[PDB]
Amino acid sequence: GKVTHSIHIEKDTYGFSLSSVEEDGIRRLYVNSVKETGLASKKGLKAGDEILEINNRAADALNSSMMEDFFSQPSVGLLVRTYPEL
Numbered sequence: 001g002k003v004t005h006s007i008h009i010e011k012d013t014y015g016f017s018l019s020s021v022e023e024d025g026i027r028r029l030y031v032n033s034v035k036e037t038g039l040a041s042k043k044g045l046k047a048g049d050e051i052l053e054i055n056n057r058a059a060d061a062l063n064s065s066m067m068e069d070f071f072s073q074p075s076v077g078l079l080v081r082t083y084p085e086l
Helices: 064-072
Strands: 003-010 016-021 028-034 050-054 075-082
Touching (some): 028 050, 050 064
Antiparallel strands (some): 003 075, 016 028, 050 075
């Protein structure tokens, strides 16, 4: 079962990329890769996580322009749905 986690990151770059899919009628955001010693990795962000929110805004209520601004700021919050570790 998947769990939902909150991540707050502070400062460069956050050390991760995102891919975007909209195939079931809702836009979804997924972590592509993570930099191992990156800022987000240190926070427990993992490749293949779904980003449910950025800065309390749903992935579906986001455009590239908002996300580019948010990731350029010295801080950022994420709501992430991820499989627990095994």
